[PDB]
From a paper:
Here, we focus on the identification and characterization of proteins selectively secreted by the first larval stages of T. suis. We screened a set of n = 6 recombinant larval proteins for immunomodulatory properties and identified an enzymatically active T. suis chitinase that interfered with recruitment of immune cells and inflammatory reactions in a murine model of allergic airway disease. While our in vitro data suggest no direct immunomodulatory effects on, e.g., DC function or T cell activation, we observed disease amelioration to be associated with suppression of eosinophil recruitment into the lung and increased numbers of alternatively activated RELMα+ lung macrophages. Since mammalian host chitinases, both true chitinases with enzymatic activity (AMCase and chitotriosidase) and chitinase-like protein (CLP) molecules which can bind to chitin but lack enzymatic activity, are implicated as either mediators or biomarkers involved in airway inflammation and fibrosis, disease amelioration by treating with a worm chitinase was rather surprising.
The three-dimensional structure of the T. suis chitinase as determined by high-resolution X-ray crystallography revealed high similarities to mouse acidic mammalian chitinase (AMCase) but a unique ability of T. suis chitinase to form dimers. Our data indicate that the structural similarities between the parasite and host chitinase contribute to the disease-ameliorating effect of the helminth-derived chitinase on allergic lung inflammation. Our findings further reveal that T. suis chitinase treatment of allergic mice not only inhibited host AMCase expression on mRNA level but also interfered with host chitinase activity in the BAL fluid, suggesting an alternative mechanism that might involve the high degree of structural similarity between host and nematode chitinases.
Residue numbers in the entry:
A (entry chain B), B (entry chain A): 32 to 399
The structure:
Amino acid sequence: KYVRGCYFTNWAQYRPGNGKYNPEHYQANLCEYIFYAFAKLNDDFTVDQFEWNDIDVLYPGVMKQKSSQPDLKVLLSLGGWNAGTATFKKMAATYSNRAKFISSLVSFLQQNKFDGFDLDWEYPESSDKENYLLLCQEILAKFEEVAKCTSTSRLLFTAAVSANPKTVDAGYDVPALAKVLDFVNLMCYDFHGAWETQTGINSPLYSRKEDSSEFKMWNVEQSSKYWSDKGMPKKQIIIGLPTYGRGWTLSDASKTDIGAPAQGSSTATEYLREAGVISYYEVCQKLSSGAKRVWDDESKTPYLVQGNQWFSYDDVESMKAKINWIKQENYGGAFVWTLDYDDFLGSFCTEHNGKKYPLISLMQEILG
Amino acid sequence: KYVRGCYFTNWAQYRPGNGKYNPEHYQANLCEYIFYAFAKLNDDFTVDQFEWNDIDVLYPGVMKQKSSQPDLKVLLSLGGWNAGTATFKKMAATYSNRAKFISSLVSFLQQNKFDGFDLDWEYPESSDKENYLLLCQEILAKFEEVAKCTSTSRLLFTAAVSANPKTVDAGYDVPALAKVLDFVNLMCYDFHGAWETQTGINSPLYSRKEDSSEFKMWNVEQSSKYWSDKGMPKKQIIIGLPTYGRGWTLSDASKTDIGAPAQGSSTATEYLREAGVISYYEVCQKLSSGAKRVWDDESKTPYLVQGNQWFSYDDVESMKAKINWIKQENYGGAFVWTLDYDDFLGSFCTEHNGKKYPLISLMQEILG
């Protein structure tokens, strides 16, 4: 039995044309859990919607999906990269601060009919290690208290967690968190990207011989193993699968290997409009335009070259390898970041004969 | 500004052919409140599903309708005519018994995602008047405590109540109940039926000059006015609207007036299969077969004659008069018993050009 999770994002509504992603684009039985990114943590530690139409439109639209998938669970995620850590740090620092946050959170979850809560603090530091654990222990205790009122099933509680072993060491009490979190969404991606001066793999399954020694742990296999070594049971370790890629502008268009020199991020793409990233469906458009694809069998990922633009990304072949490896190694399951980067219409790519969600469907197909 | 309620019944799934009623037959915005008839009160005072597929199929099927109507509220009803009063009487007799029931009910409501509770004890007698009020005060108190315990909006709490002024006098502390019930569903129907040896009107809007004095209050106008006179604010009095009729077999096929002698109940009909009752859509079937309709302008209701079969029923004209009257007198709103007696497929009646719910649609159309 495997967890299959999927992140919905409340800013994908702003993509133009056929990139615009609405709750109704979800397909029944793709995911057992949808994680809603993101709510907002106010300065006064209360919780509220982040986008103007979360409560009135998008939350109900996502909850609607339970009509064709009765087992679907929808959790609210809080935090993320852009939110930073300053407010989390102060909120977790005292019992009174944490109690105020937990009270606001529980009311927000109940009023909006969520099934659980996904804590995406990116990331707790050494100074936060104790406070982060207390926060998690007190969230679970509250959720249990709420369930005891009526003998109902309790809200779920998960967390998205760093794949960097040094970060894991500093911020997480792993054996203690295993008793309190239902599972952890391992963020084993963004290992390399436009912040570096040479091309590299966003989410390699295995290390490559040409990896420098400092990066030998910076892959799916070793990052997940580290969490297991630190005391997290494998069934609680959920492997993260990106449906986006990261891109560079090459210094030299004749040097296109992994590790080739770069002069900066890739040019912002048509739908994501953000330098240095690309969606899978945008990759399909570039392939139709004649972009060159290379399969890197060592890491089990492809990369794309179009002129001086170079992207590391994930596709059906890399997802197949990774999801089969999840079964083989008996980790807890998979989750995808995000629903809205796949070919969710089936019309952006030609090679899948119009199949919707050619990437994300693989979870149900292989693990289901 | 006006309550619009509708009763769903969990035995309408057993009617044949186009009489079979499924939750997906509900039409968005017909009702603001759906009342689910009925749960089961066990001998030990605990609450449970009545039909084998309530929890597994029908409850979530009704809840699904919130997807196309986000403001829909679904309440669970307990009691009804066939349940009788024996268990209610024992359950309400002591604080201990009521607390066991209330704890069981609150758990059942929250486990099954109900928005509220509708108490249909038919009917508290003089020996129950104090216990009935205590039961209602304690239900509301628990609902308020549960709301704080689980950080949710409190469950709604209604009751379906007698329209017989003698029964109201004996069983209901009307000013005290107004303080704890959100509103009352006035059962201003079944005033006359096959238990009587002569024909009469199921739910007359007004009294008729030929009514004997014993029945001067047995109509919508006076029974609702009585609840008002007894201390229930008009905005808490919800006027009941039947979508069924009641029938007799005439003693003399040449004597077809209101008050004509009868020798027994009407023959059981094709879909309801219960002697003495008929659905509106079954009346439509008989109108197509040449039955005679008579409009009684005094009561603002029609009756149907077909051979020696005689039915008092309600139709678009009687519903129009009653619902427009509700607005004129500023009562609290209307409710229909039941969704499954209307022409809910639009397949039985011809005078409405295939309109679904020709009767029940009038609530939305007139009360807004």
